[PDB]
Structure formats: structure tokens, C-alpha cells
């Protein structure tokens, strides 16, 4: 439709496309220490080979 709010805002449910371009930020906010990953992998291997 016409009569769009060209000046005042970026708004009117166009905020949701930010969430769809903000969720890609939450997916990389998470972090891990690689030393814990290596320790966990080592124990995963030692626990898969039982004897």
C-alpha cells in the first residue's frame, strides 16, 4: 500500500526482519574454550574404546 512512513521510523513490523538478521548474531554469541573441547574429545575416544 501507499502512505508509508518514509521519514519518522524504520518500523511497523519491519523490525521483524532485524530479528531475522539478529538471530544470526545470537547463534555466534556463544563461545567455548578449545581446551575443554580437546579434553572432551579425548575422553570420548577413550570411552568408546572400552578395552
Amino acid at each position: 500500500g501507499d502512505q508509508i512512513d518514509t521519514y519518522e521510523l524504520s518500523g511497523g513490523a519491519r523490525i521483524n526482519r532485524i530479528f531475522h538478521e539478529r538471530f544470526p548474531f545470537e547463534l555466534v554469541k556463544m563461545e567455548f574454550d578449545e581446551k575443554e573441547l580437546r579434553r572432551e574429545i579425548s575422553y570420548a575416544i577413550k570411552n568408546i574404546h572400552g578395552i
Binding site: 501507499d2 508509508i4 518514509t6 526482519r17
Partner: protein
């Protein structure tokens, strides 16, 4: 929606906004023309009749 091509309303809604600005000077022009007609009538009336 995700945009592939520039929408045609992004042109139209800027053009309409620019066009609305010229309402004022046209009315100023009309008022000036009326002023000149009044001045001319005064010259043709007040100065030549006793």
C-alpha cells in the same frame, strides 16, 4: 520480505513528497498577479477622472 529488486513505491513515495512542496509558490504567484491588476486599475481610474 527479503528484497531482490528495488521497489517501485520507493520512487513514487519520494516523488509525491517532493511534489507537495510547490503548492505554496504558485499561490504566491497568483497573489502577486492580482496585486498588479489592482495597481493597473487604480492607474486607469484614479488619475484620469475628476
Amino acid at each position: 520480505r527479503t528484497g531482490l529488486f528495488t521497489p517501485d513505491m520507493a520512487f513514487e513515495t519520494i516523488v509525491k513528497k517532493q511534489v507537495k512542496k510547490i503548492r505554496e509558490p504558485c499561490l504566491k504567484c497568483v497573489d502577486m498577479v492580482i496585486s498588479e491588476l489592482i495597481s493597473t486599475v487604480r492607474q486607469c481610474t484614479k488619475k484620469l477622472q475628476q
